[PDB]
Amino acid sequence: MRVVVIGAGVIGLSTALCIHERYHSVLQPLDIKVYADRFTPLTTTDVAAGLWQPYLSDPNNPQEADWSQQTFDYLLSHVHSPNAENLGLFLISGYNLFHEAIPDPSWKDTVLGFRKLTPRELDMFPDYGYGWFHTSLILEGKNYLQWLTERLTERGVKFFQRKVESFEEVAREGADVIVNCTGVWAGALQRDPLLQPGRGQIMKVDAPWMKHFILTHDPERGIYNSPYIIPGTQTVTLGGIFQLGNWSELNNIQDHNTIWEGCCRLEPTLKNARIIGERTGFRPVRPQIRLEREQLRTGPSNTEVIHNYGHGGYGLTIHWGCALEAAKLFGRILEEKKLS
Amino acid sequence: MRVVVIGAGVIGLSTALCIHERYHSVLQPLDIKVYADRFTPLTTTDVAAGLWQPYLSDPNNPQEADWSQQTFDYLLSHVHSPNAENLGLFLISGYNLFHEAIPDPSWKDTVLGFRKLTPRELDMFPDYGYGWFHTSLILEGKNYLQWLTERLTERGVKFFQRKVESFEEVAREGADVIVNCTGVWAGALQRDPLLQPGRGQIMKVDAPWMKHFILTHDPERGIYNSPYIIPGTQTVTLGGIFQLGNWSELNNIQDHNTIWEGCCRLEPTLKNARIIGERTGFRPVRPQIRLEREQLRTGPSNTEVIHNYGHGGYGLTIHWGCALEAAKLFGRILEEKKLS
Ligand SMILES: Cc1cc2nc3c(=O)[nH]c(=O)nc-3n(C[C@H](O)[C@H](O)[C@H](O)COP(=O)(O)OP(=O)(O)OC[C@H]3O[C@@H](n4cnc5c(N)ncnc54)[C@H](O)[C@@H]3O)c2cc1C
Numbered sequence A, B: 001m002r003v004v005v006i007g008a009g010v011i012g013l014s015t016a017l018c019i020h021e022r023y024h025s026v027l028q029p030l031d032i033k034v035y036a037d038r039f040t041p042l043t044t045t046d047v048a049a050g051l052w053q054p055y056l057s058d059p060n061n062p063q064e065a066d067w068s069q070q071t072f073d074y075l076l077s078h079v080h081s082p083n084a085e086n087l088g089l090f091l092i093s094g095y096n097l098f099h100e101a102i103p104d105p106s107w108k109d110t111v112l113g114f115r116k117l118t119p120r121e122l123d124m125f126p127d128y129g130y131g132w133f134h135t136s137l138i139l140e141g142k143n144y145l146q147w148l149t150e151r152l153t154e155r156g157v158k159f160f161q162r163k164v165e166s167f168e169e170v171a172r173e174g175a176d177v178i179v180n181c182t183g184v185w186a187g188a189l190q191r192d193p194l195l196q197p198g199r200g201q202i203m204k205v206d207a208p209w210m211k212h213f214i215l216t217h218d219p220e221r222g223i224y225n226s227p228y229i230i231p232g233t234q235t236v237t238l239g240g241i242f243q244l245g246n247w248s249e250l251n252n253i254q255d256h257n258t259i260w261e262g263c264c265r266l267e268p269t270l271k272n273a274r275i276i277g278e279r280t281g282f283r284p285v286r287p288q289i290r291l292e293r294e295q296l297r298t299g300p301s302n303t304e305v306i307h308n309y310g311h312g313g314y315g316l317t318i319h320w321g322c323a324l325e326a327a328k329l330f331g332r333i334l335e336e337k338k339l340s
């Protein structure tokens, strides 16, 4: 069975690894290749801080809540492992701040120690009257892509740098199954008017006294259009930009100033922090993830496709449950191939 | 009024600064000098990680609970200030772990967000069945001594390196008031059989993914004779040694191995952490702090003394309330000097 995974961000690499681990067998070996136009450190996944946190609103597809919890439980089970440093995986606590009262999120029982903030805690944040505290996990995107890449490479998965122009192009080279993990660019291989870029910009700063994340919200202005601060292993991410429809892969000074001034109002100690770097990326925004099989006609043959794209601002948070779901769909293909 | 403060750890410098700020006036200037045998980075204060946390047991003198709370409230009021980075001051959350249930500490309402740990949190710690989570503050000892030293120096307080052999020696040089802030060595200037060294040893390690403190307890073996892990700004402190009566200022390999093996059992990710440094210091253990006035006969004159020593494993935690108390005692001296 020749499988091609298109895409080498967290979704494509985790899906490739899950297909291999579940379905590369002694009596049915797979040949798996990854085709991608960009690899680490140059994907969207590489821009993400990697905090596990779904959106505040309930997902349109309720299975996505399961996939996020599966990812959390999976990662939590390994956070105290000696492997965790190579994954970029660690525990972190922090604040979610609101102007006024809001209902609890659906994921409040997935994270550890979820509670409302107390009055004395809220006194630390002059602009916010309500919020949460909990403990979650960070899975840093660059690190984890590097780790996934090493695991794939040691299992014989080969990687090729190319921009694919069509599913037919890949089918003509002999793929029996294509897994489409192309993030925000999926529309170029098959039009999808529900998929749009949600452009974000972040700054990385040296602020090693910051031991908590701090996410603020202004839901009417949209998720992530409010300051956020997320300590990583080496540096702290500052952000708070979400611009639907904007395809400019270029840091801009207006968004720089929005991020800096908003995060320094939130946390005045950041005025002393050295700015290390700045990045832009495109969240693959869709009303729900597209995670589903399709049969495509590709010249003289049909080809099986699994789509796995549209993970918005939560691709690291949900990737493992999606990758397991994609591998289940792959097993349905194999079961049907026996019954030819 | 000529004042000599003996001692340049956190107690002596904070007391000197509080006396200056409260009682150096236009119509009554003070001349304040600090005499010390060791200055930063070579004091006990420099060895301390600086987590605000009193002992678990209630203090013999209940005023000490007030002094600790005053210190916490003072520091918390400045933690989001642009001055905080120069003090070495930041917020941190973390765990206190026990084998079995224990009553809540008296300071549970001083810290932020105090709660019992949940079952799923306790599942992360195989050896512990009970514990707490809260948010506290770190005030790093070296940094804060440097900061106190700059504040004193800009106010004209002069520092002299010397070992003082007696209070009479200092009185003969013309001191009207001596403030005795000599930590564990106070017994050399006036015998105090209740004051003893509580020797500790720590290791500093590069583990920047550690965002929480983790303190374990085995109360029958004594406070701090159980593993602890405390992230600082740059490095993580590992410890867990408290040896009453031991005056050896020398890191030893047996205590090294106790610390390392106990902290790596607590947190297996530390097995990958690079060891940076190792230090020994002496906690000034006393059944209560000695914070009180004495009149001493010093040859032809009497001299006023304020004692401020005996702060055990909590000198950073309590220092500001003690320093304010010492300055109140200093004001009683001035009031009596008017009534000569
Ligand atoms: C500023 C920002 C912060 C974020 N923070 C977080 C966070 O803290 N937590 C969280 O859960 N998520 C976060 N996210 C979201 C997360 O980054 C995305 O959901 C996730 O990276 C999407 O992964 P992906 O693999 O689908 O896409 P990508 O990482 O973009 O990978 C897509 C791959 O497809 C390839 N490709 C596309 N089209 C073609 C083609 N035609 N031919 C060949 N290759 C092709 C690309 O080259 C690339 O290899 C953040 C995103 C942004 C922008």
Ligand SMILES: Cc1cc2nc3c(=O)[nH]c(=O)nc-3n(C[C@H](O)[C@H](O)[C@H](O)COP(=O)(O)OP(=O)(O)OC[C@H]3O[C@@H](n4cnc5c(N)ncnc54)[C@H](O)[C@@H]3O)c2cc1C
Binding pocket: B006, B007, B008, B009, B010, B011, B012, B035, B036, B037, B038, B039, B043, B044, B045, B046, B047, B048, B049, B050, B051, B052, B053, B162, B163, B164, B165, B181, B182, B183, B184, B185, B186, B188, B189, B199, B200, B201, B202, B239, B280, B281, B282, B283, B284, B309, B310, B311, B312, B313, B314, B315, B316, B317, B318
């Ligand atoms: C391993 C360890 C970890 C700790 N962690 C923490 C923590 O996280 N939080 C917390 O609250 N506390 C902590 N502590 C406790 C804290 O370090 C002490 O309580 C505090 O430093 C005592 O301060 P001090 O100024 O009295 O003593 P010191 O810092 O020892 O200063 C005493 C001064 O007196 C001088 N001196 C003494 N005798 C003479 C003399 N005859 N002539 C001249 N000078 C003299 C010395 O040279 C020195 O300048 C820790 C202590 C240890 C050992």
